[PDB]
Design a protein around this ligand. Structure first.
Ligand SMILES: CCCCCCCCCCCCCCCCCC(=O)OC[C@H](COP(=O)([O-])OCC(O)COP(=O)([O-])OC[C@@H](COC(=O)CCCCCCCCCCCCCCCCC)OC(=O)CCCCCCCCCCCCCCCCC)OC(=O)CCCCCCCCCCCCCCCCC
Ligand SMILES: CCCCCCCCCCCCCCCCCC(=O)OC[C@H](COP(=O)([O-])OCC(O)COP(=O)([O-])OC[C@@H](COC(=O)CCCCCCCCCCCCCCCCC)OC(=O)CCCCCCCCCCCCCCCCC)OC(=O)CCCCCCCCCCCCCCCCC
Ligand SMILES: CCCCCCCCCCCCCCCCCC(=O)OC[C@H](COP(=O)([O-])OCC[N+](C)(C)C)OC(=O)CCCCCCCCCCCCCCCCC
Ligand SMILES: CCCCCCCCCCCCCCCCCC(=O)OC[C@H](COP(=O)([O-])OCC[N+](C)(C)C)OC(=O)CCCCCCCCCCCCCCCCC
Ligand SMILES: CCCCCCCCCCCCCCCCCC(=O)OC[C@H](COP(=O)([O-])OCC[N+](C)(C)C)OC(=O)CCCCCCCCCCCCCCCCC
Ligand SMILES: CCCCCCCCCCCCCCCCC[C@@H](O)O[C@H](CO[C@H](O)CCCCCCCCCCCCCCC)COP(=O)(O)OCC[N+](C)(C)C
Ligand SMILES: CCCCCCCC/C=C/CCCCCCCC(=O)OC[C@H](COP(=O)(O)OCCN)OC(=O)CCCCCCC/C=C/CCCCCCCC
Ligand SMILES: CCCCCCCC/C=C/CCCCCCCC(=O)OC[C@H](COP(=O)(O)OCCN)OC(=O)CCCCCCC/C=C/CCCCCCCC
Ligand SMILES: CCCCCCCC/C=C\CCCCCCCC(=O)OC[C@H](COP(=O)(O)OCCN)OC(=O)CCCCCCC/C=C/CCCCCCCC
Ligand SMILES: CCCCCCCC/C=C\CCCCCCCC(=O)OC[C@H](COP(=O)(O)OCCN)OC(=O)CCCCCCC/C=C\CCCCCCCC
Lengths: 174, 98, 70, 115, 83, 114, 318, 347
């Protein structure tokens, strides 16, 4: 067991609590990068190496632009950190305590949330015994985007081209 | 349902609550908006990998593509708002009244 | 002259030799004098697990054959 | 397991180097020693003030092109399919659309920095 | 063809990188539809046995389905061996 | 909704093939060509029945054919086969490419003796 | 034994970094008609040791306006990722045999981008901020170009595994196969490693040490070590990717010798370029990749997609 | 903005809506919504000004939040069923998330504020396109998934929409805000009748679209964005004011005009399901919409407000641009009550 995926899920939730408490865009980007890396680890443990590395790379690239934009448009004289502001620290502590209550209750007993029913057992037990051979199922499914998924490629390419046109038009001004 | 799904759904809920509760910056709300789709990506790929839905592995990539399309749209609106008002504060988006 | 640059380059080359040679020696040492088994796929991993099971010593690199079947 | 072990090893070595750096040498710090550096004179303003970003549009286009490279990465496995004609057609479709986006931005002067 | 030649000469003097890029792209689009080896690549990818060849139950009317791998019936990779 | 029926430990007993992966990979094409009939029968049973419990006899026959094949190899060409699988075992990927000489000697031994 | 392997990978890399410092000093000196360090030891061999001891026995300071939490983290992250980039490289046996041995490199490089950004922002200084934004622009450009170039070159290979790269380059060299992509990749590696003519983040002439203006003593030495380790690692990556050495399984020492010789040649080429050329301007660098490399890179990507299909030479998946 | 860029953005919005209406996959439906929003934002920001920028920002934030909730609902439904086809959703929590996301997209109460805010922010053509198309698509999705909608939640949101639209339109004086609150009320009516007869929902959608198109084209013709600006139109072209007065009477549900048919059919259908209090309350609450329609009609047509002096030059000049299909919209929005049994053809 070793609870590796569960610990990573807890770290993921902690990073989400941080950048949702929103001290400043710098630390929000830091928390989002941490969350992306930990989610990459989670999905690596679950099986998808390409998907994990892809999401980590995508969010590392995305938060690079956010850093430049917060240096230019979202900065003040004294940027706020988690302990700097009473509201930010309150939200952060509230999120941490809520996560702690959820994890403690789920570990102690099979917690039935008001929304969903979660069973306290092994993420290793939920796995499957069967296995493939001499190819990665995730890799083949992703590569099927070109053999299958012709419609998805068309709509995605058109969406990206239209997005370029749109970002050209919005920032035109005047 | 295992606890990993519980934590991922809790992360999405936290990110959604963060977006719906602004403080000052439009940029921080955009960061919260990006976290929601990160949680959605993780949840979707955890569901797909576990059930061996082979043809569904291309869905998370499209999810990321449209996530960053939305991010680009938000950044464009943010730069326009910043050029208009001098700060990205959401308090300045009050000319229109309900 | 220009050949006094060589000793620094020689030391740097000697330093760069150590990682690869050490890794090869450790692979051979910990895999019974053979190359470390490369299991890029579930089939190869299952081969390694079966090798561990058939060996009877919980080491996959311990290989058994005709003398073991009879 | 091994990747976590080596990440821990590297981070521990870096942290130990930082600890040695910040605790071995003698420290004598006063107000002027730790003041911000502005080539010998006091800074006029604050470094936390907004800093204009003349290539803001190029960053957004970089986001979109990062999406494009994300789409294009699984190509080596996509070449192993039987539908080689369809795979090649769609790959060239994506690359042609990326080229068209670049051409449109270039011709509309999105690559030129703000003055 | 004089106007086209003048345009190409001016572009080659002004934007050789763009000229080379467009030429390479055009070659990459046109050539695959004419090469006779595209079908060979398709057959090579088709001939790769990723999964197990599940046998078929013999009902007595399968003359072209071999009973042994070495029988003359069935696919042959002799074309691939000398390639 | 019913009790799962599981075969006892007694009838799951069979003489295991205790060779290694390198040994199996060395005698792979010859094994496939010689014991094709029981292997194909077992695979057909597995893919039609869709139940591991209904093809135990075919699995035992597959094991018996494999053991007979390896005994037949050992009785005639033990040394070339030992050299071949010793060569194959060294490579991490167990490549046939690096052991062409020993493969040729093993093929010559089996083509004449058997 | 795995910890011993990790130490054997780590410590010689740092030794090579220090002696690369010495080698660059002497090479630049002799290219500039000087001698370089030749006094501290025999042919200056103790100069890296003297510099390291001085830097780690000198006092480090934290600026009054600095954010101390991210001020300390940045050198830690830089050095940790510089050391981590070396685990999947096969010489000829990688320490960690990752199935996707290239996406890990890309992700760790993109993560190592943030070290200089956080060091510059945490310093709370104007020159550090300018260096950080120069890093942002440079990262944008070289990131997109590197992604496409690497995709094409590995598309010629068949997978994202570096041992598979060795097997592919068993007979001939990727430099012979795809030399234009090779030249553009070399430029992209220069930009990625922040070496001249793209040393914009730490441009001494324009900024006073750039992002590490406020870093002194040990923390500065960590940035220097990370930079040189990244230089050697990227040269090794280029050597593996484009200059494929022959591999003998029974005597793998020959591959190690050839790999080290190629890596040293590429690193000396890096130093040669720094000595030879002036410095770019970061907007001119952005226009260099987007307006020159990117179109040709897209064209070459289309060409290298079509070539294996039209020649029936698609590489094996495994 | 270049005309080619404008027309390709409009075509992309329509392509996204068509993708939503023809797709059978939840991922493709979400893709259609995303494409619609992405191409819609510049259409709102076509005429650049702080008001347009703020309206576009608010609309984008609302639609992004709704799309995130919709994708979460899709993922949750996938978890409990392993199905991507758009049918009756297999999880009540996923259904609640999907219903709330689609209500937020449609602007149903209590997710309504962005509708008047954006409508006042953007121009008349942008408001017309917004109302029509962006109500067309999510209602298509809701009609597809109607059989699993929670009647209690749907009717609560519908009644809230009707009440809030009536009160807001009662208070407002700006024509675009009045139109937005009218849209809110009509959306309330349609979503109220949704869990009983999607055919009646489509009929009300068609009638509302026709009336809204006619009203917005008349406002564009008069070039009036406020009540007082509209009060001068009688002195320049009294025909437009009379046609708009008739259209306003129709929008209030007064017989024998076209606007009475949706309310009549919805009341009949809902009464067939042994529901009386809800149809009675919905019928009685529409009197607020009728009141502010009548207040607008008094200012423009039934009375004569003071004019100015340059209206003489405006008399001397003529209206150049023509909005085709405006007479057809005016006819179809006032005089199609006798053709009611065509709803079977709509079925
Ligand atoms: C994968 C990683 C997972 C990590 C966990 C999960 C993370 C999820 C995402 C993030 C969510 C939030 C998590 C952190 C919560 C912090 C709470 C808090 O009080 O924050 C404000 C507090 C204020 O810092 P500051 O604004 O720079 O200083 C202002 C003080 O008033 C200045 O006051 P002062 O000068 O009087 O006091 C000085 C003191 C002040 O130090 C602090 O206040 C920092 C204490 C917490 C450190 C992080 C835990 O600093 C020192 O003495 C410097 C040395 C100690 C810190 C060294 C660096 C961090 C080591 C851990 O700390 C931060 O802002 C932390 C930023 C970094 C986030 C955490 C990163 C952890 C990295 C661990 C590995 C390091 C190597 C990586 C390679
Ligand atoms: C030849 C003579 C010289 C040129 C004459 C003008 C036409 C030139 C080409 C053209 O389309 O230009 C307009 C324009 C390009 O010129 P522009 O200078 O940008 O025009 C600016 C204003 O639109 C110009 O302002 P505007 O006041 O003229 O607005 C034009 C347009 C503004 O509206 C639009 O652009 C489309 C709005 C559609 C809203 C939803 C309609 C109802 C949907 C019902 C669904 C089922 C129930 O239409 C209207 O305002 C009302 C027209 C009727 C709409 C309802 C039709 C129901 C059937 O292109 C378009 O609007 C797209 C055309 C294709 C759309 C359908 C694609 C499928
Ligand atoms: C290539 C390597 C890279 C990494 C290098 C990492 C650093 C390695 C440094 C090794 C040598 C360190 C020597 C001590 C440095 C002291 C610095 C300092 O501030 O000194 C002044 C201070 C002066 O103190 P003070 O008492 O005068 O302070 C008063 C100062 N005023 C008046 C200004 C306020 O000295 C000390 O504090 C005493 C330090 C004693 C030694 C500490 C432990 C050192 C252990 C080193 C290894 C020993 C191995 C075993 C013995 C071998 C013998 C052959
Ligand atoms: C192995 C774990 C190490 C953890 C970090 C420890 C610091 C050293 C890191 C490695 C580098 C070592 C370099 C050489 C040595 C210099 C550093 C060093 O050793 O400094 C020691 C420091 C040095 O003090 P300093 O401030 O003069 O350090 C500068 C040192 N020179 C002069 C050489 C530059 O000394 C002490 O800490 C002595 C007191 C020890 C006991 C108190 C410790 C602090 C308070 C903790 C308890 C608080 C509550 C009390 C009640 C408890 C019960 C309820
Ligand atoms: C309990 C541990 C908590 C650790 C917290 C910090 C790290 C968080 C990330 C998860 C743990 C590390 C990765 C574990 C991987 C487990 C699975 C595994 O071994 O897979 C083998 C695979 C092997 O490669 P493969 O997947 O291609 O091959 C499959 C296996 N074979 C070879 C058999 C086919 O390893 C990898 O793929 C390596 C991926 C490394 C990814 C590292 C991501 C994290 C990077 C840092 C994130 C945080 C940044 C902070 C920035 C600064 C903030 C201040
Ligand atoms: C070629 C293969 C090398 C692999 C290992 C690489 C690392 C070794 C680096 C060797 C550099 C060249 C050393 C040149 C020999 C100098 C001999 C002597 O001068 O130095 C002694 C030893 O030098 C060094 O310590 C050799 C070991 C290097 C230590 C490296 C540790 C940190 C590495 C970081 C880089 C110490 O001198 P010491 O007697 O005491 O002081 C009195 C001096 N007198 C005698 C002249 C009066
Ligand atoms: C092709 C994608 C678009 C599909 C149609 C969408 C139309 C509406 C959306 C518009 C977005 C598309 C923008 C891209 C084209 C617009 C760019 C443009 O206007 O100029 C093009 C630009 C102008 O250069 P100059 O005028 O010399 O610059 C002068 C500077 N002083 O030149 C170009 O044409 C570059 C375009 C290169 C890529 C074009 C992509 C289309 C090529 C298709 C070829 C492949 C067809 C496949 C057939 C296969 C046959 C076997
Ligand atoms: C892997 C080891 C190889 C390493 C190669 C190192 C080369 C030697 C070292 C050189 C020092 C590098 C430091 C200098 C960095 C700057 C380099 C540079 O400036 O080059 C960019 C320069 C553009 O800059 P400007 O001229 O100023 O702008 C043009 C304005 N219109 O040129 C480039 O863009 C380079 C890109 C073209 C190179 C590729 C050659 C293309 C030839 C195409 C023919 C082959 C076609 C392929 C197959 C076709 C079908 C058969
Ligand atoms: C095939 C065998 C025969 C070989 C010979 C064939 C070669 C001829 C093939 C067509 C050649 C194409 C020539 C067109 C290039 C010239 C266009 C041009 O000059 O544009 C001018 C202008 C100059 O740049 P400035 O910004 O003004 O510089 C600053 C000045 N102060 O350039 C532009 O405006 C940009 C034009 C759009 C750029 C397009 C680049 C992206 C597309 C290339 C990617 C790869 C090709 C894509 C697929 C190609 C096939 C569809
Ligand atoms: C093991 C525990 C290590 C932590 C020790 C705490 C060190 C500390 O409190 O801060 C010291 C120092 C900075 O404090 P200054 O104000 O600059 O000067 C103080 C000089 N004595 O902080 C550090 O050394 C960084 C901590 C090392 C890495 C921590 C792990 C990440």
């Amino acid at each position: 067991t070793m609870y590796i995926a569960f610990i990573l899920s807890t770290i993921f939730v902690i990073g989400f609590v941080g950048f949702s408490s929103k001290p400043s865009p710098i630390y929000g980007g830091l928390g989002l990068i941490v969350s992306g890396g930990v989610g990459c680890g989670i999905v690596l443990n679950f099986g998808g190496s390409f998907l994990g590395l892809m999401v980590f790379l995508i969010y590392l690239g995305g938060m690079l632009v956010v850093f430049g934009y917060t240096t230019a448009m979202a900065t003040e004289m004294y940027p706020e950190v988690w302990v700097s502001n009473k509201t930010v620290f309150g939200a952060f502590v509230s999120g941490l305590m809520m996560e702690f209550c959820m994890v403690y209750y789920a570990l102690k007993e099979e917690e039935v949330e008001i929304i969903f029913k979660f069973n306290g057992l092994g993420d290793w037990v939920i796995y499957d015994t069967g296995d493939s051979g001499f190819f990665s199922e995730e890799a083949m499914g992703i590569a099927a985007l070109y053999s299958y998924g012709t419609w998805l490629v068309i709509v995605t390419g058109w969406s990206l081209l239209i997005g370029v046109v749109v970002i050209m038009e919005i920032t035109r001004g005047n | 349902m295992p606890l990993v799904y519980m934590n991922i759904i809790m992360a999405f809920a936290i990110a959604l609550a963060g977006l719906l509760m602004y403080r000052s910056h439009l940029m921080s709300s955009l960061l919260c908006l990006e976290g929601m789709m990160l949680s959605l990506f993780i949840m979707s790929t955890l569901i797909i990998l576990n059930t061996h839905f082979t043809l569904a592995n291309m869905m998370p990539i499209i999810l990321l593509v449209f996530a960053a399309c939305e991010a680009a749209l938000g950044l464009s609106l943010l730069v326009m708002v910043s050029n208009t008002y001098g700060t990205d504060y959401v308090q300045n988006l009050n000319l229109l009244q309900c | 002259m220009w050949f006094e640059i060589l000793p620094g380059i020689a030391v740097m080359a000697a330093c760069l030799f150590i990682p690869g040679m050490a890794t090869a020696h450790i692979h051979k040492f910990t895999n019974g004098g053979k190359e470390k088994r490369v299991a890029h796929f579930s089939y190869q991993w299952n081969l390694m697990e079966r090798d561990r099971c058939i060996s009877g010593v919980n080491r996959y690199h311990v290989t058994k054959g005709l003398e073991n079947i009879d | 397991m091994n990747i976590m072990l080596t990440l821990l090893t590297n981070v521990t070595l870096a942290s130990l180097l930082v600890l040695i750096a910040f605790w071995l040498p003698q420290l004598n710090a006063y107000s002027e020693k730790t003041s911000p550096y502005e080539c010998g004179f006091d800074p006029m303003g604050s470094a936390r003030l907004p800093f204009s970003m003349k290539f803001f549009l190029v960053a957004i286009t970089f986001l979109l092109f990062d999406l494009e490279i994300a789409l294009l990465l699984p190509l080596p496995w996509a070449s192993q399919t039987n539908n080689l004609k369809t795979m090649l057609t769609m790959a060239l479709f994506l690359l042609i659309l990326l080229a068209a986006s670049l051409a449109y931005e270039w011709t509309q002067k999105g690559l030129e920095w703000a003055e | 063809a004089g106007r086209i030649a003048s345009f190409l000469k001016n572009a080659w003097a002004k934007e050789p990188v763009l000229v080379a890029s467009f030429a390479i792209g055009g070659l990459a689009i046109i050539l695959p539809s004419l090469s006779p080896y595209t079908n060979y690549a398709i057959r090579i990818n088709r001939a790769t046995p990723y999964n197990y060849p599940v046998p078929l139950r013999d009902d007595g009317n399968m003359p072209d389905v071999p009973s042994h791998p070495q029988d003359p019936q069935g696919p042959s990779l002799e074309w691939l061996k000398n390639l | 909704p019913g009790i799962v029926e599981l075969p006892t430990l007694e009838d799951l007993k069979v003489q295991e093939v205790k060779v290694s992966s390198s040994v199996l990979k060395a005698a792979a094409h010859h094994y496939g060509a010689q014991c094709d009939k029981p292997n194909k029968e077992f695979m057909l049973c597995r893919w039609e029945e869709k139940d591991p419990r209904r093809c135990l006899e075919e699995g035992k026959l597959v094991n018996q054919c494999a053991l007979d094949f390896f005994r037949q190899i050992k009785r005639h060409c033990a040394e070339p086969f030992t050299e071949y699988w010793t060569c194959i075992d060294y490579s991490g990927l167990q490549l046939f490419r690096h052991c062409r000489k020993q493969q040729a000697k093993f093929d010559e031994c089996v083509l004449d003796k058997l | 034994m795995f910890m011993i392997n990790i130490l054997s990978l780590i410590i010689p890399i740092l030794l090579a970094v220090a002696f690369l410092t010495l080698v660059e000093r002497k090479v630049l000196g002799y290219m500039q008609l000087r001698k370089g360090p030749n006094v501290v030891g025999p042919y200056g061999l103790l100069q890296p040791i003297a510099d390291a001891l001085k830097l780690f026995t000198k006092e480090p300071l934290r600026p009054a306006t600095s954010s101390i939490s991210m001020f300390i983290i940045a050198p830690i992250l830089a050095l940790s990722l510089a050391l981590t980039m070396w685990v999947p490289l096969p010489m000829p046996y990688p320490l960690i045999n990752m199935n996707l041995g290239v996406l890990f490199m890309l992700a760790m490089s993109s993560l190592a981008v943030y070290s200089i950004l956080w060091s510059g922002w945490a310093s709370n200084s104007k020159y550090a901020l300018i260096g950080a934004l120069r890093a942002v622009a440079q990262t944008i450009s070289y990131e997109v170009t590197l992604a496409i170039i690497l995709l094409s070159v590995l598309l010629m290979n068949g997978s994202y595994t570096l041992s598979t790269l060795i097997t592919t380059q068993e007979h001939i060299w990727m430099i012979f196969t795809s030399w234009p992509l090779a030249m553009m990749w070399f430029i992209s590696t220069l930009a990625e490693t922040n070496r001249a003519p793209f040393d914009l983040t730490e441009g001494e002439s324009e900024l006073v040490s750039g992002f590490n203006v406020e870093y002194a003593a040990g923390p500065f030495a960590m940035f220097f070590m990370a930079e040189y380790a990244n230089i050697i690692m990227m040269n090794a990556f280029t050597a593996i990717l484009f200059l494929g050495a022959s591999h003998d399984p029974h005597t793998p020492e020959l591959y190690t010798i050839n790999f080290v010789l190629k890596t040293l040649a590429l690193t000396i080429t890096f130093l040669w370029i720094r000595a030879s050329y002036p410095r770019f301007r970061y907007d001119q660098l952005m226009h260099l990749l987007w307006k020159s490399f990117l179109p040709l890179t897209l064209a070459l990507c289309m060409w290298h997609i079509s070539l294996p299909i039209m020649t029936a030479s698609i590489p094996p998946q495994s | 903005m270049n005309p080619i860029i404008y027309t390709t953005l409009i075509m992309t919005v329509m392509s996204g809506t068509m993708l939503v209406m023809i797709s059978s996959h939840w991922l493709l439906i979400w893709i259609g919504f995303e494409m619609n929003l992405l191409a819609m934002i510049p259409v709102l920001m076509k005429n650049f000004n702080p008001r347009a920028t703020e309206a576009a920002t608010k609309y984008f934030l609302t639609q992004a939040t709704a799309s995130m909730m919709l994708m979460m609902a899709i993922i949750i439904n996938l978890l409990y069923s392993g199905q991507w086809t758009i049918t009756k959703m297999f999880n009540p929590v996923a259904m609640t998330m999907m219903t709330m996301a689609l209500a937020m997209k449609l602007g149903l109460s209590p997710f309504h504020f962005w509708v008047p805010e954006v409508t006042q922010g953007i121009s008349l053509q942008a408001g017309l396109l917004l109302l029509t198309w962006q109500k067309l698509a999510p209602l298509s999705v809701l009609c597809q998934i109607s059989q699993s909608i929670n009647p209690n939640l749907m009717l609560t949101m519908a009644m809230l929409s009707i009440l809030i639209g009536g009160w807001g339109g009662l208070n407002q004086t700006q024509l675009r805000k009045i139109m937005a609150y009218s849209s809110i009320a009509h959306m309330g009516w349609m979503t109220a009748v949704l869990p009983y007869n999607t055919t009646m929902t489509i009929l009300n959608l068609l009638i509302y679209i026709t009336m809204t198109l006619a009203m917005f084209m008349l406002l564009i013709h008069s070039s009036a964005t406020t009540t007082l600006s509209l009060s001068h139109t009688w002195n320049k072209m009294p025909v437009i004011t009379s046609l708009m007065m008739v259209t306003l009477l129709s929008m209030g549900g007064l017989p024998p005009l076209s606007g009475f048919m949706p309310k009549w059919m919805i009341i009949q259908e809902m009464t067939k399901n042994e529901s009386i209090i809800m149809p009675t309350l919905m019928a009685m609450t529409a009197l607020l919409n009728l009141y502010f329609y009548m207040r607008l009609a008094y200012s423009s047509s039934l009375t004569m407000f003071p004019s100015t002096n340059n209206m003489k030059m405006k008399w001397q000049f003529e209206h150049t641009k023509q909005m085709k299909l405006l007479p057809t919209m005016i006819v179809l929005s006032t005089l199609v009550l006798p053709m009611t049994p065509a709803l079977s053809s709509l079925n």
